[PDB]
Each structure stands twice: as structure tokens, then as C-alpha cells.
Design a protein around this ligand. Structure first.
Ligand SMILES: *C(=S)NCc1ccccc1
Ligand SMILES: *C(=S)NCc1ccccc1
Ligand SMILES: *C(=S)NCc1ccccc1
Ligand SMILES: [Cl-]
Lengths: 114, 114, 114
């Protein structure tokens, strides 16, 4: 599973250890070992949500499996909660795109996960 | 729609009001409420298009519905037009990836749109 | 074909000519003329892979066709090889998401590739 956050919140407002917290929390939520989890946080972005430049975030979760109706609802609650708590972003100013990747379409270590 | 532009054009060359203009035009093109539209502009990028580092853009448009052959052609004419007029990027140095997202795969406000 | 790499490796460690090498190697691998290939390298990113922040990369290859189990394995070997050689990133700290795009869902030059 790989999680990316793009936000207009400044770098100084991203807490130390946020990347580790995301990693741990995603490991719990997906049931995957932390070793397979990648996280990417991009602050200071030029963005708008509903025309407004108040704090917001655009995110994605790519995962080989562990994607679906109920799971994505649970991920959204978890991830919006973390962004609200740590970055002071309102959940109604967060989008999260979910992608169920085929193993053959994820490259890693000179090969794919197929 | 959420619309992201990555470009090697410098930040200073992105005109004031550009995010608002994108938001407004996308609302009319896609027939979606401006309140839901997210836009993200990423200047000063290290990129090449056809091996050249002349001004270029790589973009994406994610939407729940309102994606299709004719609609995408229309969005491209619109979006290339804006990138040409405002950022001085030639339309033939722009790629835009269109994504028709399932509602179950888009998180927002602690849940999904499903 | 369009290739993006996000990495925590610093800008100064991206060698001169790297965008060209990527362009050229992708032309070879995909069979597509370099004129049709776009590349984007994003250094200095705030990232973790497996919980830690030794050099790592999250990448994507979007392509109209030329995507599949065997082809993706070959792309991964090539691209990991490049990232290892030029950016000194271990192949086992690299993810590459592969996307087979429909021509109608790629905008270019005021239209689509359909
Ligand atoms: C997140 S995308 N982890 C990578 C992976 C590899 C193999 C099986 C499941 C997940
Ligand atoms: C326009 S109303 N976009 C809302 C959206 C659609 C798909 C993914 C994220 C956000
Ligand atoms: C990479 S996405 N090149 C663009 C393209 C256009 C038409 C056919 C194949 C590839
Ligand atoms: Cl609609």
C-alpha cells in the first residue's frame, strides 16, 4: 500500500514523526507489514478546494487488494481523522482517491509483485 | 473534478487568479458544483516532453462520471486553451490523463461518495 | 508513455542528462519515438519506505498500450537499474505503478489520442 498527501499546509506544520505515524496506522488498517508501506507527504502546495485556499488535501491510496466499499469508508475515517488531528485540515476539505492495483502492475526490486 | 497541473514553467509565470479561473471553467465544463472542485498547480518542475525542456505540462483530471470520448476532447480544448493563454504552454506539449472514478473509490469527509 | 519519479534523493544528486537518459531508455523499452515521451523527476521529497527514509522512490508509468505482465517486469528491471545507477536508490526501495491508458482518456493538443 502507498499513501500520498498533497496539501497547502506549510512544511513547519507537519509534525515530526508524521510519516512514521502514517506508516504504523496504515499497517494496522491494511494488515500489511510496515516494510511494504510507502508514504509521501507534500506540503506548501498551490491548491484550492471549492475555490478556497483554506487548508485542504488531495490524497491517494494505491494498494494491491484491501480496497473496497466498506474498507475505503474505514480508510477515509482513519485518514481524515489523522489529517484533521495532525495538520488541522477539515475532513470536508479532503479528497482521497483509492486504487486497487493488480500485482502485475506494481513494479518493485527489478520485477513486479505478480 | 479534481485537476492537477505539473509544469516546468516558473511560479512567477502563473498569473494571480489562475486557481479561481480553473475552478470556474471546470465547473461549467463538467457541469459540477464549484464547491466540489479541487485544483492543484505545481510549477518549477524538472521535466521534459519529447526530450525537450521547453515549457510543457503533465496533468490529470479525476471525476466521478462526466468522463468520456467527446467530453474529454472538449475538456482538452478548454484546458490546453487555458494553459496556452495563461502559462504560455503550447497545446502539443501538454498531456492530460482523464480518470472516471467509481464513487466507492473516492474518500471525502470521513466517508466515500458511494 | 509518461514516466514520473518522486524521490527523497536531493536535487544535487540527480545527474546532468538524467531526463534525456530516461527519455531515451523509455523509447527503447516502449518502442515509442522519443518525441512522444514525457518524463518528470521530483527530488527532495518528504517520503518513507518501510518506515524509514533512506533513498527511495515512488514512480508511475502511464502508457497507451505496451503495458502487461512481461513488459512491466522488463520495465521494472530497466528503471530500477537506472534509479540504482544514477540516483543510488536500492531497487527494493522502489515502487512503480503501471497504467494502461485508453487513448480516449489521454488529452493532448486540444484533443485526445483517440
Ligand atoms: C502496497 S502497494 N504494498 C505492496 C504489496 C506487494 C504485494 C502484495 C501486497 C502489497
Ligand atoms: C469534481 S466534482 N471532482 C470531485 C472528485 C472526483 C473524483 C476524485 C476526486 C474528487
Ligand atoms: C505516451 S502516453 N505516449 C502518448 C501516445 C499517444 C498515442 C499512442 C501511444 C502513445
Ligand atoms: Cl454528475
Amino acid at each position: 500500500p502507498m499513501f500520498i498527501v498533497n496539501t497547502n499546509v506549510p512544511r513547519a506544520s507537519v509534525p515530526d514523526g508524521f510519516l512514521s505515524e502514517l506508516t504504523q496506522q496504515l499497517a494496522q488498517a491494511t494488515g500489511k507489514p510496515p516494510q511494504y508501506i510507502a508514504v509521501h507527504v507534500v506540503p506548501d502546495q498551490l491548491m484550492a478546494f471549492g475555490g478556497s485556499s483554506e487548508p485542504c488535501a488531495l490524497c491517494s491510496l494505491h494498494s494491491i487488494g484491501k480496497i473496497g466499499g466498506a474498507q475505503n469508508r474505514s480508510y477515509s475515517k482513519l485518514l481524515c481523522g489523522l489529517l484533521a488531528e495532525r495538520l488541522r485540515i477539515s475532513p470536508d476539505r479532503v479528497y482521497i482517491n483509492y486504487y486497487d492495483m493488480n500485482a502485475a502492475n506494481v513494479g518493485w526490486n527489478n520485477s513486479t509483485f505478480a
